[PDB]
Amino acid sequence: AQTVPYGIPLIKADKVQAQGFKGANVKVAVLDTGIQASHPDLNVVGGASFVAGEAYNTDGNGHGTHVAGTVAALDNTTGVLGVAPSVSLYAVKVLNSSGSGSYSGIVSGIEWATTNGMDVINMSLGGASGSTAMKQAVDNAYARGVVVVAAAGNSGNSGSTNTIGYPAKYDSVIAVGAVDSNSNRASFSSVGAELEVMAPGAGVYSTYPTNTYATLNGTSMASPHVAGAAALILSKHPNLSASQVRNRLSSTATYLGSSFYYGKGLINVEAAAQ
Numbered sequence: 261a262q263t264v265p266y267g268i269p270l271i272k273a274d275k276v277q278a279q280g281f282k283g284a285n286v287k288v289a290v291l292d293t294g295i296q297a298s299h300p301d302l303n304v305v306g307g308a309s310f311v312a313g314e315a316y317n318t319d320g321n322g323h324g325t326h327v328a329g330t331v332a333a334l335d336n337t338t339g340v341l342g343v344a345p346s347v348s349l350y351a352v353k354v355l356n357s358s359g360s361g362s363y364s365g366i367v368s369g370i371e372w373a374t375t376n377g378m379d380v381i382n383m384s385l386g387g388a389s390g391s392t393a394m395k396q397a398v399d400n401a402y403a404r405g406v407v408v409v410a411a412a413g414n415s416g417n418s419g420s421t422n423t424i425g426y427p428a429k430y431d432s433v434i435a436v437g438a439v440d441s442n443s444n445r446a447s448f449s450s451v452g453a454e455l456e457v458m459a460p461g462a463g464v465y466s467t468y469p470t471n472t473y474a475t476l477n478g479t480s481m482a483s484p485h486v487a488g489a490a491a492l493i494l495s496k497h498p499n500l501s502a503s504q505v506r507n508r509l510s511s512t513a514t515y516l517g518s519s520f521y522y523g524k525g526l527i528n529v530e531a532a533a534q
């Protein structure tokens with residue numbers, strides 16, 4: 261039996277898929293802790309590792325495999341279902357088994373993706389400080405027509421302070437916040453002026469290391485929902501530029517409240533791709 265995470269119906273991804281658009285021919289790269297490529301519910305086409313001692317196709321953490329599942333868990337009779345199950349999946353390992361990585365390793369990942377013709381880049385990661393090299397790698401991938409999506413951060417609320425991390429904070433990157441199955445913002449979801457859109461990030465069920473599925477909380481689970489949506493929109497309107505895809509996302513977002521806590525609102529892929 262194949263389970264369908266509340267995340268996909270909530271963003272209306274099920275309606276677009278029903279139309280026949282599943283992200284086919286779109287190249288999405290997940291910049292994470294890698295992916296357990298042997299997982300029966302995932303199809304990794306390629307990737308690269310910029311972390312010493314670890315190949316791109318193994319996930320000794322779980323984070324990468326789970327984020328990858330949210331974007332493209334195969335549409336079969338088992339496991340879960342991704343937002344864009346027909347996407348071309350690339351695993352770019354920029355974080356080690358402990359979920360950490362260096363600026364250089366990440367910059368190399370961003371660069372590799374841009375150079376290898378990735379259409380969408382997912383970065384479920386963030387740090388308190390940015391780097392000018394990271395800022396250029398991102399501004400360029402975006403300028404080169406690549407859709408860059410990043411988790412906004414799990415620093416939650418803290419008085420009236422900006423808790424958005426990098427690279428989510430850079431203009432060429434879409435900062436994704438998290439909400440639960442009731443569309444209520446999750447208390448851990450970072451807040452700040454740079455917040456752009458919200459997506460299911462609380463209790464999301466997805467693929468997990470050694471042929472299984474688990475549930476996790478975090479803006480990291482939210483980001484892959486927006487990356488899968490970008491891929492859906494593109495599988496329908498191949499001619500759109502990254503800038504246009506991104507605008508359709510924030511323009512057709514279901515208003516939830518102040519932009520500081522929700523951005524433009526919960527994404528609606530049916531409205532964005534129409």
Ligand SMILES: [Ca+2]
Pocket residue numbers: 262301333334335336337338339340341
């Ligand atoms: Ca499946």
